[PDB]
Design a protein around this ligand. Structure first.
Ligand code: HEM
Length: 137
């Protein structure tokens, strides 16, 4: 289930973090505008960039912590507040996060592994709700 899925992802994090981030950017190519130097590149070109894998890894490091600190897929209010207050996240709305979770859930469903997809959907939605309460537009 959800808790196990956290260990699963953490066990092979760089691969999972990149595969899922790439699924997100490929599902929604216009999200690349929030980042630097992503446009004009294929998955492999992205994966060989200096900072791409390292970035996706940090994102998923924190996501897994947030999911881990959650109860019944409900994230802590303080974890949401951190995501809202991050300088790197200042121009974002909750829509950006729900897109990431849509891509994440779809990735899980398409893969071999036995992810509790519905739980990640629920967590994604609960996180979006908490980001709103924390003041994100
Ligand atoms: C649960 C969801 C998310 C988590 C846990 C998360 C986490 C992070 C972390 C930890 C960093 C900084 C890494 C570092 O200091 O090197 C970061 C940076 C950043 N994030 Fe997120 N993020 C999330 C969602 C998103 C989404 C959906 C977007 C945009 C569509 C986004 C846009 C950015 C941007 C533009 C940066 C700065 C990249 C850079 O400075 O090189 N984040 N995020």
């Amino acid at each position: 289930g959800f808790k196990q899925d956290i260990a699963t992802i953490r066990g092979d994090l760089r691969t999972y973090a990149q595969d899922i981030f790439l699924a997100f950017l490929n599902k929604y190519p216009d999200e690349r505008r929030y980042f630097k130097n992503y446009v004009g590149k294929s998955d492999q070109e992205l994966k060989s960039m200096a900072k791409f894998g390292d970035h996706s890894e940090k994102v998923f490091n924190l996501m897994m912590e947030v999911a881990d600190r959650a109860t019944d897929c409900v994230p802590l209010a303080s974890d949401a507040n951190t995501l809202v207050q991050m300088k790197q996240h200042s121009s974002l709305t909750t829509g950006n996060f729900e897109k990431l979770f849509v891509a994440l859930v779809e990735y899980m469903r398409a893969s071999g592994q036995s992810f509790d997809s519905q739980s990640w959907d629920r967590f994604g939605k609960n996180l979006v709700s908490a980001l709103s309460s924390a003041g994100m537009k």
